Design a protein around this ligand. Structure first.
Ligand code: K
Ligand code: K
Ligand code: K
Ligand code: MG
Ligand code: MG
Ligand code: MG
Ligand code: MG
Ligand code: MG
Ligand code: MG
Ligand code: MG
Ligand code: MG
Ligand code: MG
Lengths: 55, 48, 77, 272
RNA sequence: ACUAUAGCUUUACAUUGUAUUGGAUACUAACUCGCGGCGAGGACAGUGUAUGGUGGGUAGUUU
RNA sequence: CCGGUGCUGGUAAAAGCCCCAGUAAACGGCG
RNA sequence: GGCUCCCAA
RNA sequence: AGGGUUAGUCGGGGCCUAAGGAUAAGCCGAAUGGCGAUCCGAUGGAAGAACCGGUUAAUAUUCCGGUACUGAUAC
RNA sequence: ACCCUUGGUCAGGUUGAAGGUUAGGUAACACUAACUGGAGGACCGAAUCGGUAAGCGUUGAAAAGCUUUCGAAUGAACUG
């Protein structure tokens, strides 16, 4: 899986960054508990736009 | 001696009656075949 | 209706083939299971009867896209 | 106690039945009984899945409180009664709240006694306590397997178990079968052993009593034909080969407990 | 007897994740069970595919 | 009588098998 | 009808 | 060919449930479908309630003469 | 054939288990005798269920019977 972080997570951090994870760690923990979301193209574009605007 | 046919109207209708035939897909198959052959007596319900 | 709700996969029919080429009818079953998913876009929980292939598609394109695709293709019901 | 029949008839020569010396009432409690239907070993498709079952005396089911969730409410023992559904006797209880219930009658429980359930109950015979509250070395029965699910373990007439030691969240219990195993300390057990321990001394005497109890004759496999049983066939008597069932399952020492069952982590020593 | 096969059983991949110290231990969030959220387990178990054993229980045959 | 036969223990991408031990109110034998 | 006895209740 | 079976009170049904059957919510499953707690289902439980006498070719506790009783309904 | 639910049937006679009461007896139970009691896949035997032996029948009255004889007959009974 590829996920865009929505919070800070120990051992894989950088809140609001794109990181690849195992499918289970991210389908069964991260997304349901609210840390990170799936890294679809729309989400990637939205995050890129926000980072570009805040740069 | 006791023979094989021991009549009972309730059992006859429960086993071979029109509603018993209509309750099952294979019973409706039997009814369709009998209608196609053109039987005047469709089921034991027709008899008296 | 034992069938994957995301891909529409159902059981296949084939043969067991022995070394002497004896052929016996058999069914290839789907790696099917029931799983619960958190729908983020609707903020709720859903239960889907899916295959491992359906789970791969969900983990590839997200749950919302997979559900909308399956509904468009008719697999969802 | 038991009563040995005098040999006035051949069907009574070897008959020993119970004395019924503990029973104090003959009529069951009407609100706690219901008529029970029989199976001839037939399942819901009508096919006989279990053999040698059929007929027998008509019976009514008695509601037994195997859970005992009325914590802290004292109850009075009213009667000791016969139950056709189990080998032990049962006891009628009147709670101070006004409820009624049936419990398995332990050895030594008399009409007029008081019983209680829950942690604050005294560890006296008939009381139901979580195993965390029972002193080590006590004779117990009616042991829960999961907390709140009701007693499952030690229920037959005369049977008892022992709390040998405790190890935190689990206690160690020795079973009637001789197995030693770990039980969650939040599960409940009743103090004392099940009564009617003379139930094992009874002899039917004749085939009619088995028929009354609802058993049907059992046929040996060696007196069948090969088409019916793997052990059948032959001219004259024959031994039938290695003992096995109709489906060829060996009947001498082959183990059938699932080898990967999870509960084997709680079983210290095994004995069947 | 020859050849298959239901069932049973073994291992690998999937379901299936995290940390410590690899080879084990631990965790909880997948999954399983119990009581009416709480409790008990837990990446095992069960299930799918593949695979080696076993298999007159069943079948087709030969002699 | 445990020698025989059963039963119980300690390849694809480990079982087994071996070996040892046990079991006859297991099948079986008592030249 | 009730009563007594019994257990297979 | 003609005639002959007459009920508020007899029997049944209308009411209730047993075995079993059909189903709801759900579960399972190439299809046809298989299961699954309310309904159906007497061989059981309630029925709201009489007898006497006479009479036909063929009916009678049903017709008639007495004697009664029961259920609803308008004061 | 087996099972499930709900009903029904079994003339008459005999024997005499447990238990009980009354006397004796014991430190006390036990234990003896009489009366009572009425158990039992108990006995004899109709209905009933079954089918032992012989005779008869064998294009039979009957595609399995009849007569005599015989088993069980409160039960693992028979039957709607
Ligand atoms: K036998
Ligand atoms: K065989
Ligand atoms: K008759
Ligand atoms: Mg024979
Ligand atoms: Mg011989
Ligand atoms: Mg063969
Ligand atoms: Mg051929
Ligand atoms: Mg109804
Ligand atoms: Mg007339
Ligand atoms: Mg007799
Ligand atoms: Mg006679
Ligand atoms: Mg007799």
């Amino acid at each position: 899986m590829q996920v865009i972080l929505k919070e800070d997570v120990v051992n894989l951090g950088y809140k609001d960054d794109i990181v690849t994870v195992k499918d289970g760690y991210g389908r069964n923990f991260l997304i349901p508990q609210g840390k990170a979301v799936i890294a679809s193209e729309s989400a990637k574009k939205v995050l890129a736009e926000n980072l570009r605007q805040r740069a | 001696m006791k023979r094989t046919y021991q009549p009972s109207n309730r059992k006859r209708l429960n086993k071979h009656g029109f509603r018993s035939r209509m309750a099952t897909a294979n019973g409706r198959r039997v009814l369709a075949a009998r209608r196609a052959k053109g039987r005047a007596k469709l089921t034991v319900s027709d008899e008296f | 209706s034992k069938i994957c709700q995301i891909t529409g996969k159902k059981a296949m029919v084939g043969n067991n083939v022995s070394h002497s080429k004896r052929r016996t009818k058999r069914v290839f079953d789907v790696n099917l299971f029931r799983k619960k998913f958190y729908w983020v876009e609707q903020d709720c929980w859903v239960v889907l009867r899916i295959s491992a292939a359906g789970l791969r598609l969900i983990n590839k394109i997200g749950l919302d896209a997979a559900i909308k695709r399956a509904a468009e293709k008719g697999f969802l019901n | 106690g038991i009563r040995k029949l005098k040999p006035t008839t051949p069907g009574q020569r070897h008959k020993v039945i119970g004395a019924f010396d503990k029973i104090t009432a003959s009529t069951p409690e009407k609100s706690l009984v219901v008529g029970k239907k029989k199976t001839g070993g037939r399942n819901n498709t009508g096919k006989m899945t279990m053999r040698y079952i059929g007929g027998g005396h008509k019976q009514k089911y008695r509601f037994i409180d195997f859970k005992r969730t009325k914590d802290g409410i004292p109850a009075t023992v009213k009667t000791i009664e016969y139950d056709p559904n189990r080998s032990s006797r049962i006891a009628l209880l009147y709670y101070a709240d006004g409820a009624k219930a049936y419990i398995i009658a332990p050895d030594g429980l008399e009409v007029g006694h008081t019983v209680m359930s829950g942690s604050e109950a005294a560890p006296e015979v008939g009381n139901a306590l979580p195993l965390a509250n029972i002193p080590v070395g006590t004779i117990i029965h009616n042991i829960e397997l999961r907390p709140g699910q009701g007693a499952k373990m030690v229920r037959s007439a005369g049977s008892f178990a022992q709390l040998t030691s405790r190890e935190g969240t689990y206690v160690v219990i020795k079973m009637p079968s001789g197995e030693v195993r770990r039980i969650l300390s939040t599960c409940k057990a009743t103090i004392g052993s099940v009564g009617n321990s003379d139930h094992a001394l009874e002899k039917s005497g004749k085939a009619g009593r088995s028929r009354w109890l609802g058993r049907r004759p059992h046929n040996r496999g060696v007196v069948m034909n090969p088409v019916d049983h793997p052990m059948g066939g032959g001219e004259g008597r024959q031994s039938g080969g290695h003992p096995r069932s109709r489906k060829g399952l060996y009947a001498k020492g082959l183990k059938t407990r699932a080898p990967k069952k999870h509960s084997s982590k709680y079983i210290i020593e095994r004995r069947k």
